[PDB]
Design a protein around this motif. Sequence first.
Motif, PDB file in Angstrom:
ATOM      1  N   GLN A  65      37.487  42.892  38.811  1.00 30.34           N
ATOM      2  CA  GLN A  65      37.754  42.095  40.374  1.00 30.34           C
ATOM      3  C   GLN A  65      39.683  42.103  39.853  1.00 30.34           C
ATOM      4  O   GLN A  65      39.664  41.191  41.212  1.00 30.34           O
ATOM      5  CB  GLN A  65      37.032  41.408  40.164  1.00 30.34           C
ATOM      6  N   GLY A  66      40.283  41.696  38.686  1.00 27.58           N
ATOM      7  CA  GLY A  66      41.666  41.592  39.109  1.00 27.58           C
ATOM      8  C   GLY A  66      41.877  40.166  38.793  1.00 27.58           C
ATOM      9  O   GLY A  66      40.602  38.735  39.454  1.00 27.58           O
ATOM     10  N   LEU A  67      42.956  40.174  38.339  1.00 26.36           N
ATOM     11  CA  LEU A  67      42.876  38.230  38.889  1.00 26.36           C
ATOM     12  C   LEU A  67      42.882  37.597  40.363  1.00 26.36           C
ATOM     13  O   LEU A  67      43.535  36.363  40.844  1.00 26.36           O
ATOM     14  CB  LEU A  67      44.589  38.166  38.754  1.00 26.36           C
ATOM     15  N   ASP A  68      42.586  39.040  41.356  1.00 26.13           N
ATOM     16  CA  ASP A  68      42.488  37.749  42.292  1.00 26.13           C
ATOM     17  C   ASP A  68      40.991  37.035  42.707  1.00 26.13           C
ATOM     18  O   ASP A  68      40.906  36.281  43.550  1.00 26.13           O
ATOM     19  CB  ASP A  68      42.222  39.282  43.008  1.00 26.13           C
ATOM     20  N   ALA A  69      40.126  37.044  41.111  1.00 21.10           N
ATOM     21  CA  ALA A  69      39.592  36.051  41.516  1.00 21.10           C
ATOM     22  C   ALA A  69      39.807  34.699  40.986  1.00 21.10           C
ATOM     23  O   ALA A  69      38.479  33.825  41.686  1.00 21.10           O
ATOM     24  CB  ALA A  69      38.500  37.018  40.241  1.00 21.10           C
ATOM     25  N   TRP A  70      41.393  34.831  40.862  1.00 18.28           N
ATOM     26  CA  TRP A  70      41.621  33.408  40.792  1.00 18.28           C
ATOM     27  C   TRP A  70      42.354  33.464  41.737  1.00 18.28           C
ATOM     28  O   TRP A  70      43.622  33.314  40.702  1.00 18.28           O
ATOM     29  CB  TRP A  70      41.979  32.677  39.028  1.00 18.28           C
ATOM     30  N   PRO A  71      42.668  32.396  42.615  1.00 19.94           N
ATOM     31  CA  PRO A  71      43.795  33.526  44.031  1.00 19.94           C
ATOM     32  C   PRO A  71      45.346  32.668  43.742  1.00 19.94           C
ATOM     33  O   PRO A  71      46.077  33.204  43.505  1.00 19.94           O
ATOM     34  CB  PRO A  71      43.266  33.597  45.510  1.00 19.94           C
ATOM     35  N   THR A  72      45.341  31.530  43.594  1.00 19.90           N
ATOM     36  CA  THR A  72      46.434  30.680  42.956  1.00 19.90           C
ATOM     37  C   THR A  72      46.394  30.533  41.654  1.00 19.90           C
ATOM     38  O   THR A  72      47.280  30.682  41.372  1.00 19.90           O
ATOM     39  CB  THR A  72      45.864  29.323  43.851  1.00 19.90           C
ATOM     40  N   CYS A  73      45.186  29.942  41.003  1.00 18.37           N
ATOM     41  CA  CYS A  73      45.387  29.573  39.165  1.00 18.37           C
ATOM     42  C   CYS A  73      45.731  31.591  38.422  1.00 18.37           C
ATOM     43  O   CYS A  73      46.098  31.193  37.484  1.00 18.37           O
ATOM     44  CB  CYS A  73      44.131  29.099  38.952  1.00 18.37           C
ATOM     45  N   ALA A  75      47.980  33.449  38.089  1.00 20.90           N
ATOM     46  CA  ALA A  75      49.688  33.512  37.738  1.00 20.90           C
ATOM     47  C   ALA A  75      49.992  32.932  36.022  1.00 20.90           C
ATOM     48  O   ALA A  75      50.045  33.372  35.275  1.00 20.90           O
ATOM     49  CB  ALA A  75      50.515  33.368  38.749  1.00 20.90           C
ATOM     50  N   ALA A  76      48.735  32.004  36.291  1.00 22.14           N
ATOM     51  CA  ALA A  76      49.430  30.928  34.994  1.00 22.14           C
ATOM     52  C   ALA A  76      48.845  31.791  33.705  1.00 22.14           C
ATOM     53  O   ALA A  76      49.132  32.181  32.570  1.00 22.14           O
ATOM     54  CB  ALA A  76      48.238  29.874  34.837  1.00 22.14           C
ATOM     55  N   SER A  77      48.017  33.282  34.296  1.00 22.94           N
ATOM     56  CA  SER A  77      47.049  33.537  32.991  1.00 22.94           C
ATOM     57  C   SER A  77      48.841  34.369  31.996  1.00 22.94           C
ATOM     58  O   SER A  77      48.509  35.186  31.241  1.00 22.94           O
ATOM     59  CB  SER A  77      46.196  35.163  33.464  1.00 22.94           C
ATOM     60  N   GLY A  78      49.697  34.220  32.595  1.00 20.58           N
ATOM     61  CA  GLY A  78      51.254  35.044  32.464  1.00 20.58           C
ATOM     62  C   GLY A  78      50.264  36.252  32.228  1.00 20.58           C
ATOM     63  O   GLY A  78      51.511  37.572  31.918  1.00 20.58           O
ATOM     64  N   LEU A  79      50.147  37.602  32.768  1.00 26.30           N
ATOM     65  CA  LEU A  79      50.203  38.382  32.969  1.00 26.30           C
ATOM     66  C   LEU A  79      50.486  38.681  34.710  1.00 26.30           C
ATOM     67  O   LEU A  79      50.881  37.989  35.451  1.00 26.30           O
ATOM     68  CB  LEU A  79      48.326  38.653  32.786  1.00 26.30           C
ATOM     69  N   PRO A  80      51.713  39.820  34.790  1.00 26.76           N
ATOM     70  CA  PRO A  80      52.564  39.967  36.501  1.00 26.76           C
ATOM     71  C   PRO A  80      51.548  40.344  37.117  1.00 26.76           C
ATOM     72  O   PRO A  80      50.208  40.844  36.997  1.00 26.76           O
ATOM     73  CB  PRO A  80      53.248  41.458  36.224  1.00 26.76           C
ATOM     74  N   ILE A  81      51.056  39.401  38.334  1.00 34.57           N
ATOM     75  CA  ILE A  81      50.088  39.257  39.169  1.00 34.57           C
ATOM     76  C   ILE A  81      50.650  40.915  39.634  1.00 34.57           C
ATOM     77  O   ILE A  81      49.532  41.331  40.646  1.00 34.57           O
ATOM     78  CB  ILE A  81      50.082  38.130  40.077  1.00 34.57           C
ATOM     79  N   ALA A  82      51.678  41.087  40.468  1.00 32.86           N
ATOM     80  CA  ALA A  82      52.329  42.141  41.112  1.00 32.86           C
ATOM     81  C   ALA A  82      50.578  43.363  40.423  1.00 32.86           C
ATOM     82  O   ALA A  82      51.253  44.290  40.904  1.00 32.86           O
ATOM     83  CB  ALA A  82      53.224  42.263  40.989  1.00 32.86           C
ATOM     84  N   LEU A  83      51.205  43.048  38.794  1.00 28.62           N
ATOM     85  CA  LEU A  83      50.342  44.769  38.893  1.00 28.62           C
ATOM     86  C   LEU A  83      49.058  44.123  38.250  1.00 28.62           C
ATOM     87  O   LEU A  83      48.233  45.361  38.026  1.00 28.62           O
ATOM     88  CB  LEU A  83      50.841  45.096  37.482  1.00 28.62           C
ATOM     89  N   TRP A  84      48.583  42.730  37.825  1.00 22.10           N
ATOM     90  CA  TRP A  84      46.853  43.072  37.906  1.00 22.10           C
ATOM     91  C   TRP A  84      46.008  42.221  38.955  1.00 22.10           C
ATOM     92  O   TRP A  84      45.073  41.395  38.500  1.00 22.10           O
ATOM     93  CB  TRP A  84      47.090  41.984  36.409  1.00 22.10           C
ATOM     94  N   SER A  85      46.664  41.454  39.803  1.00 24.45           N
ATOM     95  CA  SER A  85      45.626  41.448  41.424  1.00 24.45           C
ATOM     96  C   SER A  85      44.766  42.159  41.276  1.00 24.45           C
ATOM     97  O   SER A  85      43.577  41.475  41.507  1.00 24.45           O
ATOM     98  CB  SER A  85      46.377  41.084  41.745  1.00 24.45           C
ATOM     99  N   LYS A  86      44.811  43.825  41.058  1.00 24.70           N
ATOM    100  CA  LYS A  86      44.097  44.719  41.905  1.00 24.70           C
ATOM    101  C   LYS A  86      43.677  44.630  42.932  1.00 24.70           C
ATOM    102  O   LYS A  86      43.419  43.909  44.337  1.00 24.70           O
ATOM    103  CB  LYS A  86      43.305  45.545  41.711  1.00 24.70           C
TER     104      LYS A  86
END
Length: 86
Positions: A65-73, A75-86
């Motif tokens: 699902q990408g970091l879209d599964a945590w829509p606000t939080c 980013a705190a993963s440290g993975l660039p959201i623009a690349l890991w949101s899907k």
Amino acid sequence: GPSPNWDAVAQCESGGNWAANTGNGKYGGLQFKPATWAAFGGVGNPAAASREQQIAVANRVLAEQGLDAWPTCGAASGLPIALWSK
């Protein structure tokens, strides 16, 4: 190798309480909903699972699902959201 900072995401989601179970319909440090936890191989209450088991199930959710599964939080993963949101 990437290493999502799930401790950081948990801080955002639950204040770092890996056993969170407040009655808001979400569970554990990463605030899983039950249908997502079960869908990705979790059993029982996420708040009773170890941090490590919770992270294991999150890593699977991330892949599908990408970091879209945590829509606000997410980013705190440290993975660039623009690349890991899907």
